[PDB]
Amino acid sequence: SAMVEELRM
Amino acid sequence: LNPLSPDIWMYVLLACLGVSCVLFVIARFSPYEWYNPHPCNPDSDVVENNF
Protein backbone atom coordinates (compact mmCIF):
# COMPACT_ATOMS: atom_id res chain seq x y z
CA SER A 1 0.00 0.00 0.00
CA ALA A 2 2.80 2.46 0.82
CA MET A 3 4.57 1.46 -2.38
CA VAL A 4 1.39 2.33 -4.30
CA GLU A 5 0.97 5.56 -2.33
CA GLU A 6 4.47 6.73 -3.17
CA LEU A 7 4.49 5.48 -6.78
CA ARG A 8 1.08 6.62 -8.03
CA MET A 9 1.94 10.27 -7.33
CA LEU B 1 39.14 21.55 -22.62
CA ASN B 2 42.21 19.95 -24.18
CA PRO B 3 43.84 18.36 -21.08
CA LEU B 4 41.05 15.88 -20.52
CA SER B 5 40.48 13.43 -23.34
CA PRO B 6 36.87 13.47 -24.59
CA ASP B 7 36.44 9.99 -23.09
CA ILE B 8 36.36 11.29 -19.55
CA TRP B 9 33.94 14.06 -20.45
CA MET B 10 31.29 11.64 -21.64
CA TYR B 11 31.87 9.25 -18.74
CA VAL B 12 31.58 12.04 -16.20
CA LEU B 13 28.42 13.30 -17.88
CA LEU B 14 26.82 9.85 -17.80
CA ALA B 15 27.86 9.39 -14.19
CA CYS B 16 26.26 12.73 -13.29
CA LEU B 17 23.06 11.75 -15.09
CA GLY B 18 22.97 8.39 -13.33
CA VAL B 19 23.69 9.73 -9.87
CA SER B 20 21.07 12.47 -10.17
CA CYS B 21 18.53 9.95 -11.46
CA VAL B 22 19.21 7.38 -8.75
CA LEU B 23 19.07 10.17 -6.17
CA PHE B 24 15.65 11.19 -7.48
CA VAL B 25 14.51 7.57 -7.38
CA ILE B 26 15.68 7.29 -3.78
CA ALA B 27 13.69 10.45 -3.10
CA ARG B 28 10.61 8.40 -3.98
CA PHE B 29 11.77 5.75 -1.51
CA SER B 30 12.98 8.43 0.90
CA PRO B 31 10.76 8.27 3.99
CA TYR B 32 11.20 11.81 5.26
CA GLU B 33 11.49 13.89 2.08
CA TRP B 34 7.72 14.36 2.36
CA TYR B 35 7.43 17.59 4.32
CA ASN B 36 3.84 19.03 4.19
CA PRO B 37 4.88 22.59 3.11
CA HIS B 38 4.60 25.35 5.71
CA PRO B 39 4.58 23.05 8.77
CA CYS B 40 3.52 26.05 10.87
CA ASN B 41 0.07 24.46 10.47
CA PRO B 42 0.52 20.66 10.73
CA ASP B 43 -3.25 20.52 11.10
CA SER B 44 -3.36 19.10 7.57
CA ASP B 45 -1.01 16.17 6.96
CA VAL B 46 -0.83 16.83 3.22
CA VAL B 47 1.59 14.17 2.00
CA GLU B 48 3.68 16.23 -0.42
CA ASN B 49 6.86 15.39 -2.25
CA ASN B 50 10.37 16.79 -2.58
CA PHE B 51 13.47 16.15 -4.69
Side-chain angles (χ1 to χ4, degrees):
Chain A
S1 82
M3 182 56 267
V4 165
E5 178 188 5
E6 269 70 22
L7 190 142
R8 294 308 153 182
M9 181 295 308
Chain B
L1 76 164
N2 179 28
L4 276 297
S5 67
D7 176 23
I8 298 90
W9 306 81
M10 290 217 176
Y11 290 171
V12 66
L13 268 296
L14 62 83
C16 181
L17 300 176
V19 65
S20 59
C21 178
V22 64
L23 161 66
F24 152 65
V25 171
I26 300 157
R28 171 199 276 149
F29 281 7
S30 172
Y32 323 122
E33 61 87 11
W34 320 93
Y35 67 107
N36 60 13
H38 202 64
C40 295
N41 54 4
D43 309 335
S44 62
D45 281 347
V46 64
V47 288
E48 284 324 309
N49 52 5
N50 207 340
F51 309 107

